[PDB]
Amino acid sequence: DDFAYLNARVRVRRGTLLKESFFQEALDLSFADFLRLLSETVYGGELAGQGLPDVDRAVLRTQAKLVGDLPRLVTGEAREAVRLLLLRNDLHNLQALLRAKATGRPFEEVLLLPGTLREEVWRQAYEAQDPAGMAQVLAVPGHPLARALRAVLRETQDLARVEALLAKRFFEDVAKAAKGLDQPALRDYLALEVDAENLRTAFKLQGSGLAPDAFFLKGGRFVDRVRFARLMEGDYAVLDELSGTPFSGLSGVRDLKALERGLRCVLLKEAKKGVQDPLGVGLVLAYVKEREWEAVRLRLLARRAYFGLPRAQVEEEVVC
Amino acid sequence: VYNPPWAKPFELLVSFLNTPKYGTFDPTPVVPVFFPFWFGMIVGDIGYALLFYLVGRWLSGYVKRNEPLVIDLFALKLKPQVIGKLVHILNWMVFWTVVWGVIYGEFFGTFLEHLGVFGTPEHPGLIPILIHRIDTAKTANLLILLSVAFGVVLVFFGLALRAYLGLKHRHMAHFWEGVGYLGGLVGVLALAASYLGNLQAGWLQGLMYLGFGVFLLAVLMSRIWLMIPEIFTQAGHILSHIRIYAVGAAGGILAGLLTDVGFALAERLGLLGVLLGLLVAGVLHLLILLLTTLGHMLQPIRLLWVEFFTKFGFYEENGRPYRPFKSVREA
């Protein structure tokens, strides 16, 4: 056993969190007040001062310290889990890098998030020449993403496919690793995470009109291949088969935006459940998720003030 | 670009002596240091040690009778071929390993044959080494105590080299550390001796202990050293030499005593027919024997590594130029 140490610290970190009324207040504020308001709250303590970019950058940097260095600090299951989150940031970074490399668009042109894998690794990764080499750079830290690339490489070594098939392959990989990781809530969440991803994937790629089979992500349980197929045909009645599911507000939805809105919140309510997680990481995950939802909002509301946008413009999107 | 056995891998280590880093002496020693004991854990018998030649003869002759092997010099393989050509230096040492190893088995069968020495037959109608008796506590005791000695050599060899470390790399810190621990030693020898002789010291040289304990801490104190506590842990190490050697004997000995239940007996009581009803098992025992012996040798080197990578003569150690010892000694 032992999440004790994690748990106490994170609870201390949870102290820096804001009132709901912040997000409400923000609805009507000016930019100067926006700056003041953020600067008085925890991302604000590295706020780069005046201006919208300062906000975005602060949000990133604040998460960089509060989340980004967490996985290292022993290496039990949970520690791996934190590693997975930060690894998603890496995965994007990698994709971007791949594209940069691929598109004849040099080293300079990429900038990346915090993660388990960090600047120097990336710098090497870019600076690795061959697609074989890139995957081998990934072998430097050793990750299911590492594994995913090497596996992806066997057939093909060029960006677009590599990425597509990788993403699919990767999510399959995460799933297995996750079967080996044994928080029941996360196990359920993974299946649902799979499902959510399918719903949105199906949604964006609907009107391709194609088979479910080309990109049916797997581990669905409010979803299966047929539903996927159906939705891809245009069919929102797939969403209307939602009935008693966690995803229940997605019924009556027709558009992707609204779909996403519902999803983000559904996943959020579930994500918030893990609170006083015994092994901490329900709670840590939740703390993270909330920080996101908060973070997103800081930025939204920031734009709203900054550009002098209507209240009604964010009013939709600040509520879960 | 734009004697002979003893010389052969060592000859290649002469060059590796010559790579510098410091005035303290460099990697090389390992290969000539290992050999007698390396071979000398192997202390078998007709069915244990003494058939391992056939395998060596399958590295210079080969096999036919199952699937495939053709020439070990041409090292064709299931997993890197290449290596097999390279490790001819090792092929020599292995052919030698078995040959000498067989021989301390044959030392063993002096004392597990001959009717005056033990109740054992000189050469019977069954097979040598027949109703085994080195197991017997008193006989055994000697073989155990035999193991102890090689461990003593190692205590000296390592700390002496530390005193050389500071001597020739010039660090007083290293010098005093390596030297200083020997200040303790006379008293350590006292404490063992009072039980080893049951008497000698520890109450004789135990008055000398009272002065021996201070001498230690003098130059450990000259470095100042808040880093005193460690000296307990050093006490674990001595005993370790014994234990590792002890097992190298004991597991060895056990192995030879397993040929009783391999080839003199294992169902009924094994005479010359039920004996060969044990031969149903007998062929098997060879392959089982093969498995374990891979295990055995690695304790020595582990043992050696305790000393080496306490930087007692070696500048590979946790990295540092020169490369993993695994790779190093083989030429």
Binding site: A4, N7, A8, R9, V10, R11, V12, R14, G15, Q276, P278 | -
Partner: protein, 76 residues
């Protein structure tokens, strides 16, 4: 002093088992919750009422043995 019998000797064993097994049990009971509490304190006096009352509960297990031990002993 004393110079008693077998009766005292058996009861001393079970006197020990009752308290010891329970004492250990309370400690384990305490270990999971006790670890759990701590963040709440840093944050909250509002949770101080919880912390103070909550931790207490397992502890009854020890008491049963000790009351039986008080009546038994003095001639144990």
């Amino acid at each position: 002093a004393a110079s008693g019998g077998l009766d005292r000797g058996l009861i001393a064993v079970g006197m020990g088992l009752a308290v010891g097994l329970a004492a250990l049990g309370t400690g384990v009971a305490q270990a999971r919750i006790g670890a759990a509490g701590v963040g709440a304190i840093a944050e909250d006096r509002s949770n101080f009422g919880t912390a103070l009352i909550f931790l207490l509960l397992p502890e009854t297990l020890v008491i049963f043995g000790l009351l039986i031990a008080f009546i038994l002993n003095g001639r144990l």
